[PDB]
Amino acid sequence: ELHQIVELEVVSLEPLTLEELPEVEEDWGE
Amino acid sequence: LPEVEEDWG
Amino acid sequence: ELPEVEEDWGE
Amino acid sequence: EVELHQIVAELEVVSLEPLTLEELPEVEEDWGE
Amino acid sequence: MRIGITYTVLRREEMAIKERAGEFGEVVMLHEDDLLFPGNYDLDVVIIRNVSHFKALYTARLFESEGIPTVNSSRLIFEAGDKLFATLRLAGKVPVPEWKAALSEGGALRVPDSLGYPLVSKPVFGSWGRLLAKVNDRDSLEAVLEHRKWMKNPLYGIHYFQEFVEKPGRDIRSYVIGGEFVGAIYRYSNHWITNTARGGKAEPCSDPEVEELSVKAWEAFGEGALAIDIFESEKGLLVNEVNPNMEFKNAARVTGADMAGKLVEYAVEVAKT
Amino acid sequence: MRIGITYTVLRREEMAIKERAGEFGEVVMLHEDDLLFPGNYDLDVVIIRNVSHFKALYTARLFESEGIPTVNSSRLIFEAGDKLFATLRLAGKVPVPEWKAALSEGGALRVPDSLGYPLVSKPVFGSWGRLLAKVNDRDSLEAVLEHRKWMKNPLYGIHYFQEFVEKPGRDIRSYVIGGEFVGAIYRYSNHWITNTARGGKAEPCSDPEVEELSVKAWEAFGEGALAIDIFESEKGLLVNEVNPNMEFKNAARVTGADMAGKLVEYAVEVAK
Amino acid sequence: MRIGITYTVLRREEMAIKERAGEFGEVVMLHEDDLLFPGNYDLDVVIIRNVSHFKALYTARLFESEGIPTVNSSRLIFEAGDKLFATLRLAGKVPVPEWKAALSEGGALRVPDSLGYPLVSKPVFGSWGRLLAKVNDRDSLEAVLEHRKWMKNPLYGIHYFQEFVEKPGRDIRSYVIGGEFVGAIYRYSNHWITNTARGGKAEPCSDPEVEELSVKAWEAFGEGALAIDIFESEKGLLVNEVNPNMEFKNAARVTGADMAGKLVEYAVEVAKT
Amino acid sequence: MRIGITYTVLRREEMAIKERAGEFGEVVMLHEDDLLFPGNYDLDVVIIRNVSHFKALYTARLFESEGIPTVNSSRLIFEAGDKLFATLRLAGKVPVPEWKAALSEGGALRVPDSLGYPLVSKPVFGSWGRLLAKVNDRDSLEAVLEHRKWMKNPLYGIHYFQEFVEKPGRDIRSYVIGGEFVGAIYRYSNHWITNTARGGKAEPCSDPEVEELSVKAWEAFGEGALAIDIFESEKGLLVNEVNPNMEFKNAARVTGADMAGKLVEYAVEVAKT
Ligand SMILES: Nc1ncnc2c1ncn2[C@@H]1O[C@H](COP(=O)(O)OP(=O)(O)O)[C@@H](O)[C@H]1O
Ligand SMILES: Nc1ncnc2c1ncn2[C@@H]1O[C@H](COP(=O)(O)OP(=O)(O)O)[C@@H](O)[C@H]1O
Ligand SMILES: Nc1ncnc2c1ncn2[C@@H]1O[C@H](COP(=O)(O)OP(=O)(O)O)[C@@H](O)[C@H]1O
Ligand SMILES: Nc1ncnc2c1ncn2[C@@H]1O[C@H](COP(=O)(O)OP(=O)(O)O)[C@@H](O)[C@H]1O
Ligand SMILES: N[C@@H](CCCC(=O)O)C(=O)O
Ligand SMILES: [Mg+2]
Ligand SMILES: [Mg+2]
Ligand SMILES: [Mg+2]
Ligand SMILES: [Mg+2]
Ligand SMILES: [Mg+2]
C-alpha cells in the first residue's frame, strides 16, 4: 500500500521506491 | 533516519 | 524594553 | 528631537515623513555584542 | 463585587477597563506572574486581557477550574480565536469569503482548483496581519508551503486559504458585546492588509447593514465580547473573522463608543451568573 | 457501513484497523493528501489516525462539519491531548500527581514552593516523552525556562509541572474503549522516562486495580478510545495522562488483546 | 598512517571511502559520538563526512586545532558552503548568475529593480535544495520575506537572490578534487529545481567547456574536493554554487568515475601536507 | 574622509560614534535598508554596528568585497564572535576556564567526566547571557540537551561547555582597541550571569592585572576593537570571552573613558589603509 512503513516509507507505487520517513515534528505521537 | 535538519547535505 | 513580539500576540 | 531608527516602554522611530513609532523588534538569538 | 483583570502590559484599553470596573466594585489587577494554579483566588469574574491568545485561553480555562467565570470564556477564546474553527461556526449563519482547508501540501496544491488565483494563505492562530500571503500562482503557493513546512510549529501544518477579496482600500471592524452592537470603524490602507497594528487609519462606520451582519456573526457563537472583521466585496459584505481579545482604543476614540464600559458591564452581569 | 480511516503513514496500527473495518463493511483509506474541505465525503464514520496530534484534531473537526462522526471526536482529541486540560478533567475524578501551572517565567519560578524538588517539566501538547525534564534544583528550572522561552511555539509559554514520582522502574499503560477496559501493559526502562517510543519494553499487566482506575479515568471524559498512563507511587496509583491517538502495536502483541477490533467495533456503534 | 573519517550515518559514499582509505593505512571510523575536544587523537588526516554542514565545519576546525589536517578544511567548508561567501569568491573569476544581497526586507524589496522578475530566493546555507523559492512578483517577494523573518535562524535574515535562469530542463553537476576534474553529470527534471535528493535523474556529461569551467571554479578557491553546480543559459554556462560536502553515488555510478578513490588520494596528499 | 556607520537602531553607542566620526570627516549613516550589494559605495572605512551578530559579519564581508575596510573585520567578527573559534585562539595564550566541545548529544553526555559538575552550557554564537545554563547534574544536562535538540538552529548542535567558575558576585569587562587598553568595569549581579543586558550593574575596575591580561587576550587576535570578559577565580584571572561588536554605554559612563572616540580614532587609522 502507498504509505506502508517497512523494516522506511513507501512513497511511490507505479515505480515502487522506498524512502526515509519524514522529520519527527513536536506534535507527533499518540 | 533522524529528522532532516535545515543544515543537511 | 518591550519583550519579544510572539506568534500569537494580539486580539 | 529624534532621528530615523532612534530609541525614544521601548520604541523605535520607524518613519519621519509620517512620524511613526513602533515597539522594538523581538530580540533574536544572535543579537548583542 | 471583586473583578479580576488579567493582563500582560497595561495598554490604554486595560486602564480604561480597570477604571470602569472600579465603578462596579473592587478591581484586582493580575499580571501573568500573579497567575499560579491550583490556587486560592477570591474573584467573582475575571476579564481576560492577556496579549498572547494562547495564554488567554489557558488562563480562562484555569480560572473556570476554580469556579470563577471568565470574560471571554475558554470555549469562546478557543473557537473564535482559531480561524478554521471560527469559519466553521460562521459558515451556516453569515456570508463568508470562499475558503478551503487542507491537511498536507499535496492537498494544499489542489486548493487553486476550487478557489482560483489570487488566493490568501494565512495561519489559523494569527493576529495583527502576521504571515498573511497573497499567492498569485503555483510558484508562490509552493514557496509558501515550503516555508510553512520548515517552520515546524505544527499549527502551520493546517493549511487554511481564502479567495482574495477585492476590497475598496479598506475593511470594516465591528464590535458586539453580549449580543449588543456597540460600534464599527473602517480601517484604511493602501496595502491589501489593513490592520491598525500595520498602519491602518480608522474612521467611523455607520453602514446599517454591518450592524445587522455583526450581530448575526456574534449569534453564531452566542456569548461574550467579539471584535468582528468584515470585507466589502463584489457580492456584498463578508465576515472574515472574529476576535475574542478585542483591541479597541482607536475604535472607541473614532466612534465615541464606550467599548471598555460595555465590556465591564457584561462582565458584572456574568458575575451575577 | 462505510468507514473512513485518516492516516499519515500506514503503521501496523492502521493496517490492523483497516482489516477489522473491512470485516464490517466498506473501507476508505484517506491519506492526508485526500483531505480537502469543504468537500463531498460519503462516509458513515471516520477513524482518526493522523500521526500529528494537531492534524488529527483539525481533521476530526472538519469531518464533523460535514456531518460525519469521528473517532475520536475533535472535543476529545483536544481535551485529552492537552496535558493541562486533561489533568483538570481528571483531578475531579481520579488521583493524579501533584501539579502546578504558570503563565509566565516569573510565576513558574514559584512552582518549587508548592511542589518541591525534584519536579518534572513537560510541554502541554507533547507525546513520545519529548521535552520532558527532571528538574532537581533552581538552576535546572531556570535552564528549562530559558530554553522554553527561546523556542518558537507560544504553547511553550504555558508552564505545566508535576511532582517527580518515584516509580518502580516502570509505568503502566492502559486501554479503554467505549467505557470497556481492553488491556494494559507495564512499560519498563532503566531511565525515568519509560515510553516504548524511547525504548521502553512492554510486559502484560493484569492488575485489577489498574483496570478499575482506568475505567474511572475514561469516565472523566465519557467518550472515545483512550490510552491511559498510570504511575505506581508510595501513595498508590496515579493517573498521569490520557492519549487520544493511541499507539498499541506492542501492547496488542504483549497482551493478546484486540485493540484494533475494539476500536472499529466502537466506531461502527458510533456511526449508527 | 592513520586516516580518520567523521560521519553521521554510513551512506553508500562513506562505505566506499572507508574501503579506499584502507588501501593506504589504518582507517578509524569516527561517529559524531566519538568527537570530543580537546582530545588525544592519533590521525594523519580526517575526511569530513558529517551530514550537517555546520557540524562538518566545526569538526574540521577542531581537528585542525589538534594539528590534524582535514578534507575539506574548515576555511573551505565555510567559504564554499555559504552561497554568498562563495559567490563573492567566484565573482570576476567565472561567469555567475546575476545576484544581489540585502540585509533587511526593506532592502530586499529593492532587489527586483536590479534583477527583475522572475527571481530566485535561497537560504545562504542550505542544500538538496530546501527553501528555494521562484518569485514571480512583489506579492511572492513579500510572502517569502515575511516567512523568512518569522523563522528563528538569524542566517535566514541574510537575503540572497539570483536572477531566474531558464535552463533547458536540466543543470550540470561536476567534480573537481585537488585541481583535477574527475567527472560531470546532467541532472534532468520537469521542475526548475533539479537536485537528485529532490528526484533528478542523472546522465553523463562530457562537454569539454564544463570541464574547463569546473577547474576554473575550483581555482577560485584553490583547495579541496568540490562539487560544482553549473547552469546552461541563453548567455552561456554559469557557475551557480559550490559544495564542500560532496555526494556522488549517482555521479560515480553514471560516469564510472572513482570519486571516493580520488577524494581519498587527495586526503593522503593533504596528510603529507 | 568619508566614514560609514552601519546600524540597526541608534543606541547611545551609535549616537556617540556618529558624533566622534563627524569631527574627522563626513559621516554616512547606513541603516540595514541602505545595504544592497553589489553596489557602489564611496567610503574610506565602515564602522560595523549592526545589532545582529550575523548581519554584522555579512555586511563586513560585503564591504570588504567592495574594497572598503571594515572595523571590525569580517574575520575578527567571525573568529571573536564564535565562542568555540575564539576559545581555540585564546588557548595557550591566556588562562581560560576549562572547556569541552562535543558534536552530538551522546558525546556531550561524556563532558562531565572531564569537567565535573557544576558546568556551564552556552550557545556558540550567543550574547547578552542568553541560553546560558548552569548544569548541576546529569538530569539537568539531559534536559538542556533535549531542548537544544528540538531547537531549529543547527548551530545549537555544537555543544560548548565550560567548568562553572565561582566568581565573587561579579565579573570583569575590559576594552582593548588597536592594542591599547582603554578601560574596564566590574559587572555585579546577585545572579551568576552578570551581563548588563540582563540587569547586571557596572562599577569602575582599576585592577592592573586585568589591563595586562586584557592586552594579551587582544593579542591572540592581533587586530580590531574587542570587549573582553574576565572572571576572577580561586586560581587567578581567567579570560572567558571576547566580543567584536562592543556595547559600552554603562562602561563609558562609569569609567569616564571615551570608548566611542577611541573606536573612531582606530577606524580613521585603518581608513588610511
Ligand atoms: N481573503 C482576503 N482577501 C482580502 N483581504 C484580506 C483577506 N484576508 C485578510 N485580508 C486583509 O488582511 C487583514 C488581516 O487578515 P485577518 O484574516 O483579519 O488576519 P488577522 O487575524 O491577522 O487580522 C484583514 O483585515 C484584511 O485587510
Ligand atoms: N511526574 C512524573 N514523574 C515520574 N515520571 C514521569 C513523570 N512525568 C512523566 N514521566 C515519565 O515520562 C514518560 C512520558 O511522560 P508523559 O509526557 O506524561 O507522557 P507522553 O510524553 O508520553 O505524552 C511517562 O510515561 C513516565 O515514564
Ligand atoms: N537562479 C536560478 N535559476 C534557475 N534555477 C535555479 C536557480 N537557483 C537554483 N536553481 C535550481 O535549484 C537547484 C538547487 O539550488 P542550489 O542553488 O544548487 O542550492 P542547493 O545547495 O540547495 O542545491 C539547482 O540545481 C537548480 O536546478
Ligand atoms: N563558566 C562560567 N562560570 C561562571 N560564570 C559564567 C561562566 N560562563 C559565563 N558566565 C557568566 O555568564 C555571563 C555571560 O556569559 P558569556 O560567556 O559572556 O556569554 P555572553 O556572550 O552571552 O555574554 C558572564 O558574564 C558570566 O557572568
Ligand atoms: N547532493 C546532490 C547529489 C548529486 C550527485 C549525485 O546524485 O550523485 C543532490 O542532492 O542533488
Ligand atoms: Mg483582522
Ligand atoms: Mg501523550
Ligand atoms: Mg505518556
Ligand atoms: Mg558575548
Ligand atoms: Mg559575555
Side-chain angles (χ1 to χ4, degrees), chain A residues 2-7 9-10 12 15-16 18 22-30, chain B residues 2 4-9, chain C residues 2-3 5-11, chain D residues 2-5 7-9 11-16 18-22 24-33, chain E, chain F residues 1-271, chain G residues 1-11 13-234 236-273, chain H:
Chain A
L2 228 307
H3 286 270
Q4 273 187 29
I5 49 162
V6 300
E7 312 292 307
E9 195 198 325
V10 175
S12 170
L16 172 47
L18 300 177
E23 310 103 64
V24 177
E25 314 288 50
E26 62 192 11
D27 74 330
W28 277 26
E30 315 183 39
Chain B
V4 303
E5 300 165 7
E6 61 196 0
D7 197 21
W8 278 25
Chain C
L2 184 75
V5 179
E6 307 281 17
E7 295 185 335
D8 72 326
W9 275 30
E11 325 184 35
Chain D
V2 291
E3 298 176 24
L4 181 69
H5 305 121
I7 309 300
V8 177
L11 305 183
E12 177 191 343
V13 184
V14 171
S15 182
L16 297 173
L19 177 70
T20 308
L21 304 193
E22 294 184 2
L24 266 137
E26 147 157 35
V27 177
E28 303 272 309
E29 51 192 29
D30 75 338
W31 276 25
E33 312 182 46
Chain E
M1 260 265 59
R2 291 172 52 79
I3 300 166
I5 299 168
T6 248
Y7 72 99
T8 309
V9 306
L10 292 169
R11 303 168 288 183
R12 194 164 151 81
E13 29 277 276
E14 280 74 52
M15 294 317 303
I17 290 163
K18 168 171 187 173
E19 191 283 314
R20 306 289 193 290
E23 256 86 288
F24 299 91
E26 187 164 2
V27 186
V28 182
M29 301 300 296
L30 296 157
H31 188 250
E32 286 173 327
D33 295 10
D34 300 313
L35 296 180
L36 190 60
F37 299 83
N40 301 313
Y41 287 98
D42 183 24
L43 273 348
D44 303 300
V45 59
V46 169
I47 304 172
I48 298 284
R49 303 294 307 175
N50 301 251
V51 174
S52 156
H53 154 83
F54 289 105
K55 292 191 180 191
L57 172 58
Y58 283 89
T59 128
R61 177 67 185 93
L62 284 164
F63 274 112
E64 290 163 351
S65 74
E66 301 291 346
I68 291 165
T70 255
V71 176
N72 284 317
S73 81
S74 65
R75 177 258 150 174
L76 184 61
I77 287 163
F78 186 117
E79 293 231 25
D82 185 284
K83 292 212 140 65
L84 193 36
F85 276 68
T87 92
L88 263 19
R89 191 68 60 190
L90 296 158
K93 318 309 214 302
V94 289
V96 297
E98 289 188 41
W99 63 278
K100 223 69 197 177
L103 280 302
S104 66
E105 70 165 32
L109 266 7
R110 289 201 314 285
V111 166
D113 300 334
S114 301
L115 271 34
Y117 297 110
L119 84 225
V120 171
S121 160
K122 57 175 89 170
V124 137
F125 65 91
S127 192
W128 294 352
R130 300 160 205 291
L131 297 162
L132 280 266
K134 182 172 176 275
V135 169
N136 299 324
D137 54 39
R138 178 70 166 212
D139 289 325
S140 27
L141 217 200
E142 288 172 6
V144 166
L145 294 171
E146 248 287 71
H147 288 252
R148 289 287 188 73
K149 152 181 164 183
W150 282 98
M151 288 174 87
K152 286 163 151 44
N153 182 150
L155 281 326
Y156 296 137
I158 315 314
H159 303 287
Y160 176 77
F161 304 94
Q162 287 177 325
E163 64 173 312
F164 180 73
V165 174
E166 301 287 357
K167 305 188 308 298
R170 76 196 181 175
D171 72 348
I172 290 159
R173 159 59 139 262
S174 213
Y175 295 87
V176 184
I177 301 172
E180 182 186 12
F181 177 81
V182 307
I185 56 162
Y186 294 111
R187 297 179 292 189
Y188 286 84
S189 191
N190 56 224
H191 190 256
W192 71 274
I193 304 167
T194 61
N195 291 266
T196 63
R198 305 205 83 157
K201 102 160 199 297
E203 48 171 39
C205 170
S206 315
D207 186 345
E209 211 72 9
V210 324
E211 168 169 344
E212 183 189 336
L213 183 62
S214 300
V215 172
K216 267 53 269 203
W218 184 91
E219 288 177 355
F221 298 86
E223 58 170 320
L226 286 176
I228 304 165
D229 270 53
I230 289 158
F231 298 167
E232 296 160 280
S233 77
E234 41 150 8
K235 56 202 169 166
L237 299 179
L238 307 172
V239 177
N240 174 48
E241 76 144 7
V242 130
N243 292 288
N245 211 299
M246 55 175 58
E247 281 186 301
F248 55 78
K249 100 175 214 164
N250 301 122
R253 178 179 51 75
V254 164
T255 61
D258 191 9
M259 317 268 180
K262 301 269 192 166
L263 181 62
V264 163
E265 281 168 21
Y266 177 78
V268 322
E269 291 295 317
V270 322
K272 296 182 263 208
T273 62
Chain F
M1 180 54 50
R2 200 152 138 86
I3 303 174
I5 299 165
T6 64
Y7 70 103
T8 311
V9 303
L10 294 173
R11 303 171 285 189
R12 210 97 194 288
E13 327 292 345
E14 284 81 49
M15 296 305 301
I17 294 163
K18 183 232 264 256
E19 189 283 319
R20 293 300 193 209
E23 295 177 356
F24 283 81
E26 199 166 353
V27 194
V28 183
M29 299 303 289
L30 294 158
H31 189 244
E32 296 180 321
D33 291 355
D34 304 312
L35 299 182
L36 191 55
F37 298 84
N40 319 89
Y41 294 92
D42 183 50
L43 261 22
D44 296 302
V45 61
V46 169
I47 303 178
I48 303 279
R49 302 295 303 176
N50 308 238
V51 169
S52 162
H53 162 73
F54 291 106
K55 286 190 188 186
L57 174 47
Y58 286 85
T59 129
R61 177 67 188 92
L62 285 160
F63 278 113
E64 287 163 354
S65 77
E66 301 290 336
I68 293 162
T70 269
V71 179
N72 287 315
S73 79
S74 62
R75 173 257 159 177
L76 184 67
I77 289 160
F78 174 63
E79 291 265 321
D82 188 275
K83 296 207 152 53
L84 184 44
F85 277 70
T87 106
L88 259 17
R89 194 69 75 186
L90 291 166
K93 316 256 300 221
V94 290
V96 299
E98 285 181 42
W99 65 273
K100 217 71 186 182
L103 282 298
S104 72
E105 161 173 351
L109 263 5
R110 290 207 302 283
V111 172
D113 303 331
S114 317
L115 262 32
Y117 294 111
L119 73 271
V120 172
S121 162
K122 58 177 90 176
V124 87
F125 64 97
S127 187
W128 293 348
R130 75 174 63 88
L131 266 14
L132 282 254
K134 182 176 182 286
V135 182
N136 300 334
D137 59 39
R138 190 174 193 75
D139 288 314
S140 175
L141 209 212
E142 289 178 6
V144 168
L145 295 168
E146 249 298 87
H147 289 263
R148 292 285 170 83
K149 170 187 155 196
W150 281 97
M151 285 165 146
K152 296 163 87 145
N153 206 145
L155 272 301
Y156 292 121
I158 316 314
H159 307 277
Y160 175 84
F161 309 89
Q162 288 175 321
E163 66 183 318
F164 173 78
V165 175
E166 292 175 22
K167 305 191 302 305
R170 72 195 183 184
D171 77 337
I172 292 159
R173 168 83 151 207
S174 215
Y175 295 88
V176 183
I177 304 182
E180 181 201 333
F181 173 85
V182 319
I185 58 174
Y186 301 102
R187 300 186 289 195
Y188 273 83
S189 176
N190 299 298
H191 201 258
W192 70 271
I193 303 171
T194 60
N195 299 72
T196 56
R198 297 178 81 159
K201 196 57 144 58
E203 299 294 343
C205 173
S206 66
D207 185 331
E209 249 82 283
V210 330
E211 167 165 5
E212 184 188 328
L213 179 65
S214 298
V215 173
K216 278 144 62 180
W218 180 98
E219 280 182 34
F221 302 83
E223 55 169 296
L226 292 171
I228 300 169
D229 290 26
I230 286 155
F231 300 164
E232 295 155 299
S233 77
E234 70 189 341
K235 302 178 294 192
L237 296 183
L238 307 163
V239 184
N240 170 48
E241 72 144 4
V242 163
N243 289 282
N245 190 32
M246 62 175 64
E247 279 172 309
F248 56 84
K249 61 164 183 177
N250 294 300
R253 170 177 60 85
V254 147
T255 63
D258 187 13
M259 330 276 188
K262 297 284 178 154
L263 182 58
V264 172
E265 177 183 52
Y266 174 76
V268 346
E269 189 159 54
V270 158
Chain G
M1 181 180 192
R2 283 159 58 75
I3 301 162
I5 302 166
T6 63
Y7 67 99
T8 315
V9 287
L10 294 159
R11 303 175 282 194
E13 21 270 295
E14 281 74 55
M15 284 280 130
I17 291 160
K18 180 198 209 291
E19 201 258 23
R20 292 282 173 277
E23 297 164 17
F24 295 89
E26 249 266 304
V27 180
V28 184
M29 297 304 290
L30 297 157
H31 187 245
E32 291 178 334
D33 292 354
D34 301 318
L35 303 182
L36 203 60
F37 294 88
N40 252 228
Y41 294 94
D42 182 29
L43 305 167
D44 292 292
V45 56
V46 172
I47 302 177
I48 305 292
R49 299 296 304 173
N50 302 252
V51 175
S52 159
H53 153 85
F54 289 112
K55 287 185 185 200
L57 170 62
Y58 285 85
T59 300
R61 181 64 188 93
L62 287 161
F63 278 119
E64 289 164 353
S65 87
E66 298 287 347
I68 296 163
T70 68
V71 171
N72 290 302
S73 71
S74 58
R75 182 208 161 249
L76 185 64
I77 294 165
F78 177 53
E79 297 221 79
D82 187 282
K83 304 207 88 80
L84 185 44
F85 272 73
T87 288
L88 265 19
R89 202 138 293 284
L90 297 166
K93 318 273 202 181
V94 292
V96 295
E98 287 197 353
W99 65 272
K100 211 76 185 174
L103 282 305
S104 62
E105 57 219 303
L109 258 5
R110 295 203 311 278
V111 167
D113 290 318
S114 319
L115 268 44
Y117 294 111
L119 68 281
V120 178
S121 171
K122 54 185 82 171
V124 127
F125 64 91
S127 186
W128 280 354
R130 67 189 64 82
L131 293 160
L132 276 272
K134 183 165 182 295
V135 182
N136 294 331
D137 57 31
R138 174 140 176 170
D139 290 320
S140 309
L141 223 197
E142 286 173 23
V144 171
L145 290 169
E146 260 271 308
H147 280 264
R148 227 89 138 184
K149 190 191 80 191
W150 283 96
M151 290 173 86
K152 275 300 307 302
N153 208 145
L155 282 332
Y156 289 130
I158 317 314
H159 304 290
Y160 173 87
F161 300 97
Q162 281 175 322
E163 63 181 316
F164 173 77
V165 177
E166 289 149 295
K167 310 188 295 298
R170 75 192 180 179
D171 79 337
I172 293 158
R173 172 79 150 197
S174 57
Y175 297 79
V176 183
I177 297 174
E180 188 197 325
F181 174 82
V182 303
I185 60 169
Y186 287 123
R187 294 182 295 192
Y188 290 89
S189 175
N190 297 325
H191 205 248
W192 71 277
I193 306 168
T194 74
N195 296 247
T196 64
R198 166 265 152 69
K201 305 297 203 74
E203 303 294 338
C205 175
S206 63
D207 183 9
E209 190 179 339
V210 327
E211 169 170 11
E212 173 163 42
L213 177 63
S214 302
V215 64
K216 291 173 185 181
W218 180 94
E219 287 172 350
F221 296 89
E223 62 167 293
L226 287 184
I228 300 162
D229 290 45
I230 291 162
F231 300 164
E232 289 159 289
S233 78
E234 286 190 278
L237 300 182
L238 306 167
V239 177
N240 168 50
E241 85 146 343
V242 159
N243 301 93
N245 307 309
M246 59 168 52
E247 290 192 300
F248 56 81
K249 66 175 164 60
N250 294 312
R253 192 236 317 163
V254 168
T255 61
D258 191 6
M259 312 277 182
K262 301 267 89 154
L263 172 53
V264 165
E265 285 180 27
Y266 179 64
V268 302
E269 171 167 334
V270 164
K272 276 42 261 222
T273 317
Chain H
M1 262 265 62
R2 270 162 54 82
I3 295 168
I5 302 171
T6 61
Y7 66 98
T8 309
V9 295
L10 301 170
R11 302 167 290 183
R12 271 97 261 277
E13 341 285 356
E14 281 79 55
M15 294 308 312
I17 293 162
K18 173 176 152 61
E19 187 284 321
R20 308 278 189 281
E23 187 161 21
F24 288 96
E26 176 176 8
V27 175
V28 181
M29 295 300 287
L30 299 160
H31 187 246
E32 287 173 7
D33 290 0
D34 300 313
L35 300 180
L36 198 54
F37 299 87
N40 11 88
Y41 292 93
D42 184 27
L43 290 324
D44 299 294
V45 62
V46 171
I47 306 176
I48 303 295
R49 300 295 305 178
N50 305 248
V51 176
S52 154
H53 166 69
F54 283 111
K55 293 185 172 190
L57 176 47
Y58 284 85
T59 126
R61 177 65 185 104
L62 281 159
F63 276 112
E64 284 163 350
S65 77
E66 302 289 352
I68 292 163
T70 251
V71 177
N72 287 311
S73 70
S74 71
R75 182 208 149 279
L76 186 61
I77 289 167
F78 181 69
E79 297 265 315
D82 185 280
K83 296 289 204 289
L84 186 39
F85 275 76
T87 289
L88 265 20
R89 222 128 213 286
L90 293 160
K93 305 212 81 204
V94 287
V96 298
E98 293 183 26
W99 61 276
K100 218 72 181 179
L103 281 294
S104 68
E105 188 185 315
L109 267 341
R110 306 201 303 276
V111 169
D113 294 314
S114 293
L115 272 42
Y117 292 109
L119 74 287
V120 175
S121 166
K122 60 178 97 163
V124 83
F125 64 94
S127 182
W128 294 355
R130 87 174 52 84
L131 295 168
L132 275 262
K134 184 170 189 289
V135 182
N136 297 334
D137 56 37
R138 166 97 181 187
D139 287 316
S140 326
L141 216 213
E142 288 174 19
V144 167
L145 293 176
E146 257 282 301
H147 288 255
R148 228 56 132 45
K149 183 204 162 183
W150 283 94
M151 291 176 83
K152 37 61 230 4
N153 195 162
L155 263 333
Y156 290 130
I158 312 311
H159 307 272
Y160 177 85
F161 304 95
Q162 294 178 312
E163 65 182 327
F164 177 74
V165 179
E166 297 209 71
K167 312 187 300 305
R170 70 191 183 190
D171 78 340
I172 293 157
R173 156 57 69 82
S174 66
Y175 298 83
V176 179
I177 299 179
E180 176 192 344
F181 178 80
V182 319
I185 56 165
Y186 292 114
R187 294 177 303 189
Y188 285 88
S189 173
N190 203 27
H191 200 261
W192 71 275
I193 304 175
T194 62
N195 299 254
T196 61
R198 297 179 73 106
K201 308 294 294 186
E203 294 282 3
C205 171
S206 62
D207 180 356
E209 286 190 340
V210 337
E211 162 154 7
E212 187 205 66
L213 184 64
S214 293
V215 173
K216 291 192 216 302
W218 180 97
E219 281 169 0
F221 302 86
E223 63 167 316
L226 289 172
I228 302 155
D229 293 25
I230 290 161
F231 300 168
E232 302 159 87
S233 76
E234 63 173 321
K235 65 189 155 165
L237 303 185
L238 301 175
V239 177
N240 173 40
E241 207 220 348
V242 102
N243 290 279
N245 190 200
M246 60 177 60
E247 280 178 296
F248 53 81
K249 68 179 171 191
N250 303 115
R253 174 176 60 78
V254 127
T255 62
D258 189 20
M259 322 264 187
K262 296 289 187 178
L263 178 70
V264 164
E265 287 172 12
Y266 176 74
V268 318
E269 291 296 284
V270 329
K272 298 158 179 170
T273 331

